[PDB]
Structure formats: structure tokens, C-alpha cells
């Protein structure tokens, strides 16, 4: 009995965990025994190889087999996947970054469109969902549309434009796919929450079609807004009539750990996980990948690391340890 | 002299131990040199290698290589093996779980007949037994059946069926290999031992061959059940005109291990391996697995461990260190 049967029994879709699929991981029989465990993944994303660069790497030239070789693996297991991410202004390629000719509102208007549609038709119901916006919101001043090269461009229309877009692929085809906006910093109470909200309200308010919105919880032993605060947050959001989902949730830890930061991981995990149990529209919690030795945060968060529910004290290719972690996210689901 | 000299020299045909063979524990010639060491183990079990995901990864065809490489080397330190094992719930390759169609009762009772038989058929003495059916009861409700591909598809008849056809490979090829039901929390007496009791008795009253049951013995420090406990359960078994062997014994403890908890484990593997020596009928122990470095419990308990003979203070490739916990087995003997 594992994260995913438990989150099952309480409703939810699934526990999902990201895997940087393909990737070394593959390599790794005792990391790709534990993500083959149904018992405690139903649902994945794929932590990169449907982004904006691997997907277009050329204007115009689309490039699937990554993709599908990720979406090939997840079927076997019977995941869920949560497509991710179409328009986000990182990891973009260089045709985008850098073009020999200034993009105008019209020339990127419809490379986000063409991006956007051929990805959400190609890919179809593989896709439990889209994160079809990942990070528009500014963290300063926290209210506002963060600056780059889509939002320069297009201007603000840029967010409902891709939604209206995704949209138009999903009627096209007889899709079933759900459209998200994924953010971080936005699991609490406070300016930006609020914007994402306002997003939401705001398609809505264009019969433009939005599902849910990701909740991508990066947090900080110690930091993570208390269960108490993430069930009100959660509130907010589904009153939209709209689902959410713990998206990316790890939490890291100043390393060294110690028995006292380590402790707080266990409570901080359990408090996210007991926070999507408490909301019915909160439709479950990806982890960002679940292996200490393959997780981002040591290379995106300076002097910082330990945020997964298994380690390999051994390193690459060795046996899992599992943490106490994983212990809070079933007992979160239990009670 | 060591445990299976020990053992030996008491009747028993094995003192023994898994292996997750082939694999990393191969890259280690410390362990390597203690799980060749004849002294300690004269048996031996394939953590893996052997199971259903691994002899059929697709529907008819058959992969061997892996379980003869396990049975070359236990052969050459003169082991025994308990193969293990043929029908079982869990690690069932996609074929079976993510299929096409969808399984009916008679595609999936093929599926099963062939598997059982072509395994038995195929690997003939190199076994000493098959586990035939791994852990078919539930823990919740304890007496009853586990929910599963093979009992939801089948019903509960499919414990009785692949008993039936690992005999008729054994009948055909006139093989001497012993055929064993195997399963957890049915080492004291229950609802779900009694259970396993009632499988027996189901088999030997139809006149299907079952030779013995496997008593895992995953135990927690403090909570095994006491020897007095175990003699009497293991007499239950044997009474049906059986044997009994305890298959995968292990005693793991919350870390870290204090001087309570390790002595709490000293008389726990005790308990266990003399309950096995004062019963005429259990042919054997079998820990799963002997080195701290490689055991199973980690990876699924969290803060748990410390569950095994030996281990590296130092990590993988550095010298065992034999622990209290194998004296203790030595004195039961
Ligand atoms: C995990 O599943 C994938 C997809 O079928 C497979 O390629 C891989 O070998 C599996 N790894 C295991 C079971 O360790
Ligand atoms: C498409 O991607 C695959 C793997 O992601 C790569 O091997 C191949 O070269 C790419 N083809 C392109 C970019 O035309
Ligand atoms: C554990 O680490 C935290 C974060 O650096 C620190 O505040 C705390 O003092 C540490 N506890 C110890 C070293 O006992
Ligand atoms: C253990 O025995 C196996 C089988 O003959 C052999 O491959 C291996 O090298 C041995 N390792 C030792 C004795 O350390
Ligand atoms: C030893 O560990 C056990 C199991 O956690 C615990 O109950 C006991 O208090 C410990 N005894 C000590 C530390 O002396």
C-alpha cells in the first residue's frame, strides 16, 4: 500500500512524481523500480522533454520522439500524465531568444499559436492535462505580469491567448484535456496568488476555457505555509470553479541535514499532501521527482538539497533509501 | 564452522540465504566471498532473477539466462536452491497488467498453466523446490484471499491449479523437485496461518501434490513471535504431512540499533532458527539476504534497518563485520 493507492482512496487522481525521462534515470534500475511502482505513482510529468526547446528546437520544425518515448514509458505504468509546459520564459532556444530579425506583436503572436496548437492537437488525450502558461506572474512587485520575451511582445494578452488557442486544439480534436496555469509562490495567501486568481477569473470571464491551476510547491523546510494556510489558498482557487493540483512539490533542506530540519520536511510534506486531502477539487500531488541523486535543487538553490522522499546513499545505480518524508505523505492521506 | 555446517550437522538440509544475484552484490568481493562461503550457507533463494516478470517478459517467450546464471553460481558452492517463485501478485510485467484485451478467466488460466509448467518443466533438479504460490492470502480480512490479477480473473482456484500443473511437469519429467505454498504473517497462530492450513488440507484432500510452506519470516525486533510460539505453529503445518522451512527471515529494527534493540534481535533470530531446530519436519532457515548493505528493508521501511547477519560499517567493497545477531543463530543450532 503506497502514496498512490492511498490519494486514490481519498478521491484523487493520483500521488505523480516528474522523472527527467529520457535521461540517465533509465539507467538506473533501482530509481526506475520505485517509478514503475503503481503503489505509489499513478501520475508523471515529464520534468523536460516536452518543453518549448525540445519540442520546436527550429521555427516551425516540431520534434516528438522524446516526448513520446517519456509518454511510451508512463502508458506501461498506467500514469496519468500531466503535459508540461508549453509558453514559459526559460529554457527557451535560441531562434527565440536571439533571432536575426526583431519579433513584432504579429510574428511571435503566431509562434505562440502555432507552438501552443500543433503541441495540444499532436499529443491529444496522452495528456491528462496541459500546463499551458508556467510562471507569468513577477515575484516583484508580487501582483504583476512578469517581464519576458512573450509578455514584452504581446503584452498581457499573451496568457489568454495561448489558453484560447489550447482550446481551439482541444475542440478540433474531441479532446478531453485540461488546460492549467502553473505557478510558484503562489500556495499562500498574498499578492501573487491573488493575480493567478484574477488570471482565472479573467478567462472565465472571456469563455475562454481554464481548468485548474498548478501550485507548484518549492518550499523550504520551515517556510511552507502551514496546512492551515494551504487549505484557505486552495479555497480560494476552487471557488473558481476550477481544480488545483501540488504540482512540483519537494522541500529542501540547508545542508547539512540535521534531526530538527529533517523533522521539519516531514511535517512540511505532510502539511502540502493533508492540504490537498482536505480540498475536494484539489485532484492530487506531484512530487519533483522523488530521488535526492536526480533532483533539481541542488544546481537551482545554492548551499541547499536533501527535498526528496528517497536517497541513494551509494549514489547512481544503488539500492533506494526511503525518508521518513514519505511516511508524512501517507499519513496525510490516511487521516 | 559456520551456520550450515551447524545446520547440517542437526538434520536440517540448508542453513541458507537470498541473494539478489545477478546484480550489484556480484561488484562486491567481500560479500561475494562470504555468500560463496559454504560454511554459512549450503542453500540459497534468488531474490529476483526467477520471477515471473523476468522468465516471461513477453506472452510465450522465455528468458532463462538470468536464473541459469543465478543457478551456475549457487552450484558452484554446492547450494541447494529454493526457486522462487512462479505465481505471485506483484512485478508482473505490462503484458499481463497493461494488456491489450482484457484477460478472461480461461486466457488468463493459460497464461498461468503455462507459465507454472514450462518453469517447472524447464528447470528440472537444478531445484530443489518452487515456490508455486507466493503470499495468495490477505492480511485484511486475515483468513481470506488476496485480491489479485490471477484470483479476480481465476478465482480461488488458481492456487489449486498451479499446484496441479507444477505435478503434472514434475509427473512428466519425472523430477524429484518439492512444491512449497509460501507466505508472511502466518508464522503464529491466526486466521491467515490457519488459512494457509486450510490450503493444505484443500490440495492433499483432491490429491494434488504440495510438499511444504514457507514461513517468510520478516520479523521486527521485539514483535517475532516467541520460539514457543513458532514450535507449535510450525506443528500445525506439519501435522498435514508436510514440511516446513523458514524462507526469508530477517529481524529489522528502528534505527539507530541501541544495546536493547540489538539484544532484542539476538533472541529474536535465535527464536527463530531454534523453533526451526526442535521441529523434525522444517528442512531449514533461509535468511533474505545476510549483509545490512543490500537488504530489502531500507528501501521500504523508512528508519528502519540493521535487519541482517552482517554488515560493512565502511559501505560496499569494504570487509563484512559478522554481528551478534549470527552468534545467536549459531547457538539455536
Ligand atoms: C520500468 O518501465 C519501463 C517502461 O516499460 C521499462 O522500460 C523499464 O525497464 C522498467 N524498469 C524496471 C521495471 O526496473
Ligand atoms: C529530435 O530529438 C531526438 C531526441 O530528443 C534527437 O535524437 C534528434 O536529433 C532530434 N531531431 C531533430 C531536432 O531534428
Ligand atoms: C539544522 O539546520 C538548520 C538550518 O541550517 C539550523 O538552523 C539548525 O541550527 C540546525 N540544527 C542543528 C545543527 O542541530
Ligand atoms: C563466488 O563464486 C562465483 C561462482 O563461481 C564466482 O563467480 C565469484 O568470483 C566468487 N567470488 C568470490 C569467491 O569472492
Ligand atoms: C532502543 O530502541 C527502541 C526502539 O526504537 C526504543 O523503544 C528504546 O527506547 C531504545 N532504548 C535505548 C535508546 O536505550
Given at each position: 500500500?503506497?502514496?498512490?493507492?492511498?490519494?486514490?482512496?481519498?478521491?484523487?487522481?493520483?500521488?505523480?512524481?516528474?522523472?527527467?525521462?529520457?535521461?540517465?534515470?533509465?539507467?538506473?534500475?533501482?530509481?526506475?523500480?520505485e517509478?514503475?511502482?503503481?503503489?505509489?505513482?499513478?501520475?508523471?510529468?515529464?520534468?523536460?522533454?516536452?518543453?518549448?526547446?525540445?519540442?520546436?528546437?527550429?521555427?516551425?520544425?516540431?520534434?516528438?520522439?522524446?516526448?513520446?518515448?517519456?509518454?511510451?514509458?508512463?502508458?506501461?505504468?498506467?500514469?496519468?500524465?500531466?503535459?508540461?509546459?508549453?509558453?514559459?520564459?526559460?529554457?527557451?532556444?535560441?531562434?527565440?531568444?536571439?533571432?536575426?530579425?526583431?519579433?513584432?506583436?504579429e510574428?511571435?503572436?503566431?509562434?505562440?499559436?502555432?507552438?501552443?496548437?500543433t503541441?495540444?492537437?499532436?499529443?491529444?488525450?496522452?495528456?491528462?492535462?496541459?500546463?499551458?502558461?508556467?510562471?507569468?506572474?513577477?515575484?516583484?512587485?508580487?501582483?504583476?505580469?512578469?517581464?519576458?520575451?512573450?509578455?514584452?511582445?504581446?503584452?498581457?494578452?499573451?496568457?489568454?491567448?495561448?489558453?484560447?488557442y489550447?482550446?481551439?486544439?482541444?475542440?478540433?480534436?474531441?479532446?478531453?484535456?485540461?488546460?492549467?496555469?502553473?505557478?510558484?509562490?503562489?500556495?499562500?495567501?498574498?499578492?501573487?496568488?491573488?493575480?493567478?486568481?484574477?488570471?482565472?477569473?479573467?478567462?472565465?470571464?472571456?469563455?475562454?476555457?481554464?481548468?485548474?491551476?498548478?501550485?507548484?510547491?518549492?518550499?523550504?523546510?520551515?517556510?511552507?505555509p502551514?496546512?492551515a494556510?494551504?487549505?484557505?489558498?486552495?479555497?480560494?482557487?476552487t471557488?473558481?470553479?476550477?481544480?488545483?493540483?501540488?504540482?512540483?512539490?519537494?522541500?529542501?533542506?540547508?545542508?547539512?541535514?540535521?534531526?530538527?530540519?529533517?523533522?521539519?520536511?516531514?511535517?512540511?510534506?505532510?502539511?502540502?499532501?493533508?492540504?490537498?486531502?482536505?480540498?475536494?477539487?484539489?485532484?492530487?500531488?506531484?512530487?519533483?521527482?522523488?530521488?535526492?541523486?536526480?533532483?533539481?535543487?541542488?544546481?537551482?538553490?545554492?548551499?541547499?538539497?536533501?527535498?526528496?522522499?528517497?536517497?541513494?546513499?551509494?549514489?547512481?545505480?544503488?539500492?533506494?533509501?526511503?525518508?521518513?518524508?514519505?511516511?508524512?505523505?501517507?499519513?496525510?492521506?490516511?487521516?
Open positions: 500500500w503506497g502514496l498512490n493507492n492511498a490519494a486514490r482512496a481519498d478521491g484523487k487522481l493520483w500521488f505523480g512524481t516528474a522523472a527527467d525521462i529520457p535521461g540517465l534515470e533509465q539507467d538506473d534500475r533501482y530509481y526506475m523500480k517509478y514503475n511502482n503503481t503503489h505509489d505513482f499513478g501520475g508523471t510529468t515529464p520534468a523536460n522533454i516536452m518543453k518549448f526547446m525540445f519540442t520546436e528546437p527550429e521555427q516551425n520544425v516540431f520534434n516528438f520522439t522524446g516526448a513520446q518515448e517519456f509518454l511510451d514509458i508512463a502508458f506501461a505504468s498506467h500514469k496519468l500524465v500531466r503535459c508540461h509546459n508549453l509558453i514559459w520564459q526559460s529554457e527557451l532556444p535560441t531562434w527565440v531568444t536571439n533571432p536575426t530579425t526583431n519579433w513584432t506583436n510574428t511571435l503572436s503566431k509562434v505562440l499559436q502555432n507552438h501552443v496548437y503541441l495540444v492537437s499532436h499529443f491529444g488525450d496522452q495528456c491528462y492535462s496541459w500546463d499551458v502558461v508556467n510562471e507569468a506572474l513577477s515575484d516583484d512587485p508580487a501582483g504583476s505580469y512578469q517581464n519576458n520575451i512573450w509578455f514584452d511582445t504581446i503584452g498581457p494578452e499573451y496568457v489568454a491567448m495561448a489558453f484560447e489550447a482550446e481551439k486544439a482541444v475542440k478540433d480534436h474531441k479532446l478531453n484535456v485540461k488546460l492549467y496555469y502553473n505557478d510558484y509562490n503562489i500556495e499562500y495567501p498574498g499578492p501573487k496568488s491573488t493575480a493567478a486568481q484574477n488570471i482565472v477569473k479573467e478567462l472565465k470571464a472571456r469563455n475562454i476555457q481554464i481548468d485548474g491551476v498548478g501550485l507548484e510547491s518549492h518550499f523550504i523546510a520551515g517556510e511552507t502551514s496546512q494556510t494551504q487549505i484557505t489558498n486552495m479555497a480560494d482557487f471557488s473558481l470553479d476550477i481544480d488545483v493540483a501540488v504540482t512540483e512539490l519537494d522541500v529542501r533542506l540547508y545542508l547539512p541535514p540535521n534531526a530538527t530540519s529533517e523533522a521539519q520536511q516531514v511535517a512540511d510534506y505532510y502539511a502540502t499532501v493533508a492540504a490537498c486531502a482536505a480540498t475536494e477539487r484539489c485532484i492530487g500531488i506531484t512530487v519533483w521527482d522523488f530521488d535526492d541523486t536526480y533532483s533539481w535543487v541542488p544546481s537551482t538553490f545554492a548551499g541547499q538539497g536533501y527535498a526528496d522522499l528517497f536517497f541513494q546513499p551509494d549514489g547512481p545505480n544503488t539500492p533506494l533509501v526511503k525518508k521518513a518524508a514519505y511516511d508524512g505523505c501517507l499519513q496525510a492521506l490516511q487521516h
